[PDB]
Design a binder for these strands. Structure first.
Ligand SMILES: [Mn+2]
Ligand SMILES: [Mn+2]
Ligand SMILES: [Mn+2]
Ligand SMILES: [Mn+2]
Ligand code: NA
Ligand code: NA
Ligand code: NA
Length: 320
DNA sequence: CGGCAGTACTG
DNA sequence: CAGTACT
DNA sequence: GCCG
């Protein structure tokens, strides 16, 4: 990154807008930040700034103040609530609205939350693991978690295929959580396995808490056995084989990569989701779907890229 | 002016 | 439904 | 916040 002295300041404002609920302004900041973090050269001119897709006059103005003064005055006017809103929003299951409500009601510390807040079932689990869920794991540990799920799955049906996606599959050295996709080539045997699979992982002691238990996705908490182990977030999704390519593409991400591809598909009268790539999709003037279109066959990730007119990208170059 | 991805849970 | 979460 |  050639523009650390710029992006460090702007990320502070991005986080401030985000925890305060100003989601679209925060998205603009996030995009400008990766745009600036990807430019080879330090930015030198106002005219240099606007050159960058994702930087307009407002952002260019800010960048100029930074290079001429070394600072951004807006930083000095960020609300005192923001560190607390960030503290509270880092509880799994609490977002901006819950954080703002707790702040309004006078809460200022996790001790206040523990002793006085009404927590949802998910939020009480998030609070209990507050520190663990903010720590990343070595990818070696993500492998052990993937293999634990796979052995429990393959015990029920040898044909089940399990793949760790997310940051693991993009090849990162550390992972925030483990994202496991499960399917079955026979197009049938994936059905109703959650019952037995989660029960199997629970009877081990491996699964320690459940956050979401849906028909197709599970979000929870695990911990490998032995000393020196932290609780880790684990997500599992079970999909039919006909959706494997799109599910793999979705679950591998990154998030910004997925949003970029989905926006591209929209421009082409298409729609991309974790289930399918569709064409001839009918939308209103508001960008909203009002007609479903036709599902396109996508046996592999490469086919999704091809049907969108894009060169194929390995998971590691999807780390946007 | 107005979209900014598309979807699944939860209560 | 609003809220939060997933990539 | 940016951009079509
Ligand atoms: Mn992940
Ligand atoms: Mn995850
Ligand atoms: Mn722990
Ligand atoms: Mn994530
Ligand atoms: Na620009
Ligand atoms: Na949260
Ligand atoms: Na009180």
């Amino acid at each position: 990154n050639h523009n650390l002295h710029i992006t460090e300041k702007l990320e502070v404002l991005a986080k401030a807008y985000s925890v305060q609920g100003d989601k679209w302004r925060a998205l603009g900041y996030a995009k400008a930040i990766n745009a600036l973090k990807s430019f080879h050269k330090p930015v030198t001119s106002y005219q240099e700034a606007c050159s960058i897709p994702g930087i307009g006059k407002r952002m260019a103005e800010k960048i100029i103040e930074i290079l001429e003064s070394g600072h951004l005055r807006k930083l000095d006017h960020i609300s005192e609530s923001v560190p607390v809103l960030e503290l509270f929003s880092n509880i799994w299951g609490a977002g901006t609205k819950t954080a703002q409500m707790w702040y309004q009601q006078g809460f200022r510390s996790l001790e206040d939350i523990r002793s006085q807040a009404s927590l949802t079932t998910q939020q009480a689990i998030g609070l209990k693991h507050y520190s663990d869920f903010l720590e990343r794991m070595p990818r070696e540990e993500a492998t052990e978690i993937e293999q634990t799920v796979q052995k429990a799955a393959q015990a029920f049906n040898s044909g089940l295929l399990c793949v760790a996606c997310g940051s693991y599959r993009r090849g990162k050295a550390t992972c925030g959580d483990v994202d496991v996709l499960i399917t079955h080539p026979d197009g049938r045997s994936h059905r109703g396995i959650f019952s037995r699979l989660l029960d199997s992982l629970r009877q081990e002691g491996f699964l320690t808490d459940d956050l979401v238990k849906g028909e197709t996705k599970y979000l929870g908490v695990c911990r490998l056995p032995g000393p020196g182990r932290r609780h880790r977030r684990l997500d599992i999704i079970v999909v039919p084989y006909s959706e494997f390519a799109c599910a793999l593409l979705y679950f591998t991400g990154s998030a910004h990569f997925n949003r970029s591809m989905r926006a591209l598909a929209k421009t082409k009268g298409m729609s991309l989701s974790e289930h399918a790539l569709s064409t001839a999709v009918v939308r209103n003037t508001h960008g909203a779907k009002v007609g479903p279109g036709r599902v396109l066959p996508t046996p592999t990730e490469k086919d999704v890229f091809r049907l969108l007119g894009l060169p194929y990208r390995e998971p590691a170059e999807r780390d946007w």
